[PDB]
Write a protein that binds this ligand. Structure first.
Ligand SMILES: COc1ccc(S(=O)(=O)N(CC(C)C)C[C@@H](O)[C@H](Cc2ccccc2)NC(=O)O[C@H]2CO[C@H]3OC[C@H](OC)[C@H]32)cc1
Ligand SMILES: [Cl-]
Ligand SMILES: [Cl-]
Lengths: 99, 99
């Protein structure tokens, strides 16, 4: 699909059998979700944003479906005001910005 | 231009006669710059990010050049770890996400 930016570029995701919405976020290196359970081991990581720092759980090689497209990548679980899909996963979709 | 997202989508901006770089950020409703002087009146505003909140100055009808394209819009000045171009200005470029 092609998306204009008059509205937030929100897509449906499926992860660990859970359905959620997330923002396609070219400003995010990494993918960060709040409202989700993932199984298995994970590494503490700190990530910064406008308001400072957030402590997140790093989960590696997570299967995720983003607007129908199946990928495997790193997912961070932690407090975020919005679920965000970062460039780590958008590169798997072959996503481009056009102007 | 069309760009891919293997690297951060950073563009050159010119604002109030100052040259800077900024991230094209589909996850940002608003444009937030740290390292710049704008003249005239402005309004307190609080904006929420990953890590919480930053206090910013809202400047309206600011002339800005983004990768060669002249626009006028709202610019927030405040602490941000990265200068960001939000959808308020990317819609003025006719920017789209494609996958
Ligand atoms: C290395 O890994 C990451 C590091 C940082 C981030 S981030 O979320 O902090 N961020 C980085 C930017 C600030 C350099 C990505 C942004 O797209 C972020 C994504 C985002 C979206 C919503 C809430 C919080 C964060 N957006 C905003 O903070 O937007 C601000 C500014 O405009 C307003 O619109 C939305 C917010 O208002 C709600 C305001 C993500 C992954
Ligand atoms: Cl739109
Ligand atoms: Cl990844």
């Amino acid at each position: 699909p092609q998306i204009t930016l008059w509205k937030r570029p929100i897509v449906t995701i499926k992860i660990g059998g859970q359905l959620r919405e997330a923002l396609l976020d070219t400003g995010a290196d990494d993918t960060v979700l709040e409202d989700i359970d993932l199984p298995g081991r994970w590494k503490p990581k700190l990530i910064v944003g406008i308001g400072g720092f957030v402590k997140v759980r790093q989960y590696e090689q997570v299967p995720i479906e983003i607007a129908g497209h199946k990928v495997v990548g790193t997912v961070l679980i932690g407090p975020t005001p919005s679920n965000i899909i970062g460039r780590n996963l958008m590169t798997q979709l072959g996503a481009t910005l056009n102007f």
